[PDB]
Subunit: 290 residues, 4 copies
């Protein structure tokens, strides 16, 4: 029942990640105590902790129309795109972020392929963080007594093929043909296998995290209502795509890898299909055939 603690590592980058985690700790504490007000607070904590890291030059927030430029005093090398509070019914909500090195708004419009670090936090019974700096995915638990994030699994790997599919089937009347076919195959396998189970929390970080630890596939594809999908490329899709690919998974828009999409605006939406590679590949077969 006794432990020793040791500091864990994965320059300006380290200070920036510490400050993003420090904001996550504060948001966790606010969420536990608890809408519009939480969104504002969360945004303030992220922006201000990130700015006073002295590591940032440009931020993009889900909450702010335009990119935020760091005061010249505090400027550093990195660009951060984040969703401070993504997602009341205690459904686990989250924080999502991706970090780039600078190249103006320009700097925030890079291919996901250029990511240097990314992560998400999920505010559940425990506050969990998944993080990658390009050498796999590590999972951490917030210890709010220490004020520190504890490593709980190294180099998380997603299953090659899962048995869960996850999307809002309430949009069935708007689905494109490939989504309709794929869903039909999950429920009516044509190969003598059992149907997949269905899960959809309706909070992206919750659904993506389940997909990472249990395997399967998560989808918010384009539909007649949302022709470009709903989820946001810079600070939702790209970060989770990076995490999922670093765990051995795939993430696609249907027509290309999410991380290869060249962004055309900071609040651009894209379709998102991700998870176990054999599952995503099966979805991709339905696309190409339609």
């Amino acid at each position: 029942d006794m432990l020793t603690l040791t500091r864990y590592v994965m320059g300006e980058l380290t200070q920036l990640l510490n400050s993003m985690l420090t904001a996550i700790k504060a948001i966790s504490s606010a969420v536990r105590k608890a809408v519009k007000k939480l969104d504002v607070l969360s945004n303030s904590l992220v922006i201000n902790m990130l700015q006073s890291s002295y590591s940032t030059c440009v931020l993009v927030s889900e909450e702010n129309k335009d990119a935020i430029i760091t005061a010249k005093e505090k400027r550093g090398k990195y660009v951060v795109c984040f969703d401070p509070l993504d997602g009341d019914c205690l459904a686990s909500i989250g924080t999502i972020f991706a970090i780039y090195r600078k190249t103006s708004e320009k700097d925030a419009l890079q291919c996901g392929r250029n990511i240097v670090a990314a992560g998400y936090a999920l505010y559940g019974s425990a506050t969990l963080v998944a993080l990658s700096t390009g050498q796999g995915v590590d999972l951490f638990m917030l210890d709010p007594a220490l004020g520190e994030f504890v490593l709980v699994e190294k180099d998380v790997k997603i299953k090659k093929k899962g048995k869960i599919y996850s999307l809002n089937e309430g949009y069935a009347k708007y689905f494109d043909a490939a989504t309709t076919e794929y869903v039909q195959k999950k429920k009516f396998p044509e190969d003598g296998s059992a149907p997949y189970g269905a899960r959809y929390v309706g909070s992206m970080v919750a659904d993506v995290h389940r997909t990472l630890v249990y395997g399967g596939i998560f989808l918010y594809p384009a539909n007649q209502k949302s022709p470009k999908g709903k989820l946001r490329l810079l600070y939702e899709c790209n970060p989770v795509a990076y995490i999922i690919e670093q765990a051995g998974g795939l993430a696609t828009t249907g027509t290309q890898p999410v991380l290869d999409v060249k962004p055309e605006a900071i609040h651009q939406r894209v379709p998102l299909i991700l998870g176990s590679p054999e599952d995503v590949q099966e979805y991709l077969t339905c696309v190409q055939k339609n």
Copy 2:
């Protein structure tokens, strides 16, 4: 930023509820720190806290094959049927319980209509308890610093009609005709209205709680795989049926109210459809017509 605290109330009954809440506080703390081991612990905490309340005579636990009879020393008037830990991916899991007055195992086999109190706890970012002693539903938050449950809403009422439907559609190939028709109507409304949204966490307490605070309908109906449904009558369906009806909702097996089912065994399963009354009533129309 300053508060005063006041004790809240809804004899042996009060001691019993205090001890069930005390077990819930301990389980919350165990869950936050975290499978089979948790199930065992949770069960131990409930049984032992309940037994030393000196208010119980018979317990039924999801975890135990036979009913547990309280030592004659500690015996009181009440019977408690509970699921100590219902539901790893931080999906909110829960504890469910219903309390009866005695009439042997016999005493645990009463109609839901005979319930004196019931509740559930959901272990999310916060640990929430819904409770009723027959005069409506009250919602409480665990304050683990005080070690006490704080009232956060009195007399919770569910919406007459919602816009969410919640079931595992991965069982579509096993659905009975009425379930197939109902799902089809939610996705393809024949009245010019928008489709319902779909949500399914796959943890009953999470799905039921969302249904109470946002409205809509939750279903685990009979299907070819599970001809009697999956969820357990004594300590899952009856307790949540009691809560939901006390909030102005309905809960049915498809052929009768859950609380009117006369149990034939302690671990008996029944189909469960519950939520907003107009939604459940619509489901019932699909049944009667098939």
Copy 3:
């Protein structure tokens, strides 16, 4: 085991007290996790939370040589003198503050008699706050789960006469004659009564708080080493003098009430003798006779 919470009250004044409590909550959390660094942090939290209350115009901090003037944007009516962190061996350390209405540094140099509110926090096993706005002393416990201060006793009253005396007797060779005589009487009562017990934590807030709840007397009188005493008039002696007098006690320098001392500098020291009135009065008799 169930509670209801109700907001408690004692305009700009209320916003200011909320922000001082909010800083106390943050300091509590920092202390629990834990020298020079804590002093700096504590100071930052107080100054910044107080400034963005929009209720302050001038601050005096134990940590800062000169008075801090609030930016004209954020200016309000009140003046706050505080010791952000007063007192490693887990000895309970504290935060002390007094609030005045403005009249420049001038505004911080008022008689204690002019205080509008004052308090201290003690960071023990629990974080406790004593507070007065002039209508007695109220005691609060920090509930760090709610993020709120809970009332635990109204209108705290100190005993007329106690049985504890509290001072650093290691300074005996420097004591003035009246202190020597008084100490001698506590140990060698000339009236057939039992000796007083001795207690000295060596952290002022700990010693003062014990004196309030158990009764007796606390002293840091002048001595040959410290001819004006050690403790600071504006943000140690005056605040605790105000609290102690509001609980029915007395606080003196030996020659006059602490709250009547007209300050001659912001970091001025004064002797401090406080506690149960009959005890302080006995000390005062030793003074007048010498």
Copy 4:
């Protein structure tokens, strides 16, 4: 801001220490929430956690007149003497314990020299445990979020000579000549050095812990009122004597080392003088000369 955790170690002995720590965690939580009732609870937690370790055969508690014999079912090799709750004014109170290997009550009446492990917990702003299994003293912090004790210093060593003396000088009129002389020398050094500072919290664990981390001397010697001292040999003096000696200090009754006293009853009191060795040695010189 990221950490890794590693299990720390110092057979039945390990299970016993885990269960004593588990009781300490529960007591910490009770203290934080808070007299006679706490004493009872604390005692229950220790006894029951210790008994179900399956490592004990005989317990002695400050709270119980006679030794407690473990049910033959649960019996193991070890004997535990403990003070479950030693020491309301937030003064840090504590838990003290010493562990022996068996030789009946007989087994609890061994010389301190026979101790296999001992420790104390102090319930402050943080809950700290000092522990030794005979290879020095290790200091741990309770992390109540993890439910685990974190190592914060290895092999703690007390200063050879300190500058604090700690005793209740309110007993001056009852002191024996050697105590009077020693106190006089601390206040009136005859060697041109400065007087010692005085500290006395009046809670033994608080005073002993300060003495370990800051150095100096702590005394509760015999006096006319308490001719055998006040503190209890088996579960106060012996445990802290063992800790203090393992940190390079000394602990004496005035006439012999505490750990060499052969106990004559389980609730026997002895005088206690402990701390920095040069300080204790100086006290011993005053004894021998009187």
